[PDB]
Amino acid sequence: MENIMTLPKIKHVRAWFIGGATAEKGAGGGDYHDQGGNHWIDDHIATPMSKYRDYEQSRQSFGINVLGTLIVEVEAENRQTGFAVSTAGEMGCFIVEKHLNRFIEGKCVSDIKLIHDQMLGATMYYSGSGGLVMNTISCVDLALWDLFGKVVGLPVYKLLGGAVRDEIQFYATGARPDLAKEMGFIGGKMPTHWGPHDGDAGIRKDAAMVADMREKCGPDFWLMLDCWMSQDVNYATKLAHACAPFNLKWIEECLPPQQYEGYRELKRNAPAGMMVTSGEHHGTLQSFRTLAETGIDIMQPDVGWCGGLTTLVEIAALAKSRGQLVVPHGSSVYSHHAVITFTNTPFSEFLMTSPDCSTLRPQFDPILLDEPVPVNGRIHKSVLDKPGFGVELNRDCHLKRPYSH
Amino acid sequence: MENIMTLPKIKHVRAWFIGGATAEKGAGGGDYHDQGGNHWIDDHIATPMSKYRDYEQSRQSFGINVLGTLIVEVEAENRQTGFAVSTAGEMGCFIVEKHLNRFIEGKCVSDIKLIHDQMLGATMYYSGSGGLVMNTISCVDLALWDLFGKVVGLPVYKLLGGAVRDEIQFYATGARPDLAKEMGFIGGKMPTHWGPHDGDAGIRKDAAMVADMREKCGPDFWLMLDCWMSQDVNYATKLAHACAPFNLKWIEECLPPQQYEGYRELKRNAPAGMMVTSGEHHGTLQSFRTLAETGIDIMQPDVGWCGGLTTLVEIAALAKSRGQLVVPHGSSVYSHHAVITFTNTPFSEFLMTSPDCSTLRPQFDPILLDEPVPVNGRIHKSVLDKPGFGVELNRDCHLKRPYSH
Ligand SMILES: [Mg+2]
Ligand SMILES: [Mg+2]
């Protein structure tokens, strides 16, 4: 047998950020919500805070954009690099440069799972199993997979065992399911604009929004509702039943992440055939074990928030073992390379970054160079035939390096 | 009726830090683990990382001390101030100065619960329900209660409805239960030094450690084991049964926080009469609802990590409703003022900050001025008869202010 390919050790790990409270607001990139004004993603979206008059119209007003984008780049001894982006910004840089670097530098570029376990174990006392700290860990994990793929010379999807479908079909999230249908998407997920404090009027208005789009899009184009942790079991139950006549495919993240018991009850109360989903804010495989056992239909981890690709692959197996689907939240290429290899991820999400949902602005615009976007609502596997996650870091963005080591 | 006491509005909120990766290592204060060398708290303590040779001897080596102390001070329009400390450091300062300040400034000093709900709702998308972000929220909550108490002129324990006992009796956590007995404590909790990877030898060694202290302390002095998230169900079960002959009162935090299902199984497998506890790393009332339902005997939230005093009081009611006890993790005065009013907190914890557990070095030494310490293993309620949490900020420490607004 031939001698194996020689692999370099990891030399440096660096972290930068753009956007967030200490940089330029509206930088976009990794933080989906770090947008400018007049953006659908900030237009009276129901949230745990919209019950407050001062925070009802804008999520930005309560600080959904304070973190900004975290960028992690790992450089091997042979000078090759790999990178990834997520939501964490400056604080994410602290974690990487002042803590996690000790487990990263000096390792082989193939020691991905090892570094992953060490990051989880070393931060367990302050990670809270999700959110900020997990977003940071996820970003490092993705940067490592990117570097490994670029060193080996293969797309991440091939390293994982290959594609199980020739193309990824997408549904679009935004305020214009009708325009999404025109673009070729298979469905459209809309955000709810009213919450529990709005009562029956709120239910009537969001249900009317769904009815209107059903009329405009026809019966086969899927329609879904995203509730961004803004409701309670009763309100979610009433809304789901109010939308049943229009064949709403699923109602998403109705409750805060810790409310597993509530999700179990909500799923039990759901109209026959209508799915209940959640997961974008959950982190760690164990949390997904608990979430899966509530009986919800689809878990939706964000690859950059759940713990990384390493964790995503485990979550996919968990769901598959139960005969269920896993449909990641956004994530662009970080999701594409993974889900195209998952038999139980028949479709993916494309979260509209276009202010009015009329164009195909890239998912992480503009931090990723040559970022692929759906063509006729799909991304063919050949589009992913590039090393690692197939993109390059846009250094024309004003990247800030708050910490060093 | 007389006109009510006039209350000022909150003018400023400021955040500082000491210790941590960007300051002086070993600063102590809020971060219990930010100690120097030769400290029992870093002496081969079993952890999720001790299975790794390079991280077996020292928790500091894997970074248990990177955060340091977060200090939050709230100033009212009448110039009176209130403050609190916790574990979060520089990153905690970012959260307070760049995000949470918008919900704090301008409110009445009595709007504590309102600010609390807004902090939770606004950070839900990145808090992960515990850890770093929750520690920060908790610190703000405590600072608010401190300010309110100082403005009103009453100790927090009286504002809460008064003491239900004349003194708080303590058990001591550290490597010397025998010295703790001499000091007047009612029991001693020791850390385990070996983990699953050590197998039967590890169980034999930690059990022998317990047997030795039982011999030295007698039958009535309580002995407990702290496992700092380092085990799995089987190992914890074996260790608990190995310690049953010595009447180990309880075995604490055997599993990582997300493993609710494991805790349920462990409690079921526990020797008759032996308690199973956890909770110091959990956050948010909902997580404690789930933890409580696993059947464990005592939940141990840290007042500065679980969400604050506001959350602690709710957790106490949850436990009380189930006929169970709540015994907070460390927390000094932040716990004292609360638990002295809880019928279901018959005793409290004093975590030895003394390197060799031979003296009564204050719990948060040296960031808190005039910090009370147990006398004969107890703290009489009269010791707490000072405004707010009864202490002042030691500004002789080199406090750093990384952010402004
Ligand atoms: Mg969603
Ligand atoms: Mg403990």
Swiss-Prot record, chains A, B:
Pfam family, one: MR_MLE_C
InterPro entries, sorted: Enolase-like_C_sf (IPR036849), Enolase-like_N (IPR029017), Enolase_C-like (IPR029065), L-Rhamnon_dehydrat (IPR023444), Mandel_Rmase/mucon_lact_enz_CS (IPR018110), Mandelate_racemase_C (IPR013342), Mandelate_racemase_N_dom (IPR013341), RHMD-like (IPR046945)
Cofactor note: Binds 1 Mg(2+) ion per subunit.
SMART domains listed in its UniProt record: MR_MLE
CDD domains in alphabetical order: MR_like_2
Record's keyword annotation contains Magnesium: yes
EC number: 4.2.1.90
Record-annotated site: Increases basicity of active site His: 302
Other comment: Reaction proceeds via a syn dehydration.
Role noted for this protein: Catalyzes the dehydration of L-rhamnonate to 2-keto-3-deoxy-L-rhamnonate (KDR). Can also dehydrate L-lyxonate and L-mannonate, although less efficiently, but not 2-keto-4-hydroxyheptane-1,7-dioate.
Subunit structure, interactors included: Homooctamer; tetramer of dimers.
UniProt family annotation: Belongs to the mandelate racemase/muconate lactonizing enzyme family. RhamD subfamily.
Protein's UniProt name: L-rhamnonate dehydratase
Organism: Salmonella typhimurium (strain LT2 / SGSC1412 / ATCC 700720)
Gene: rhmD
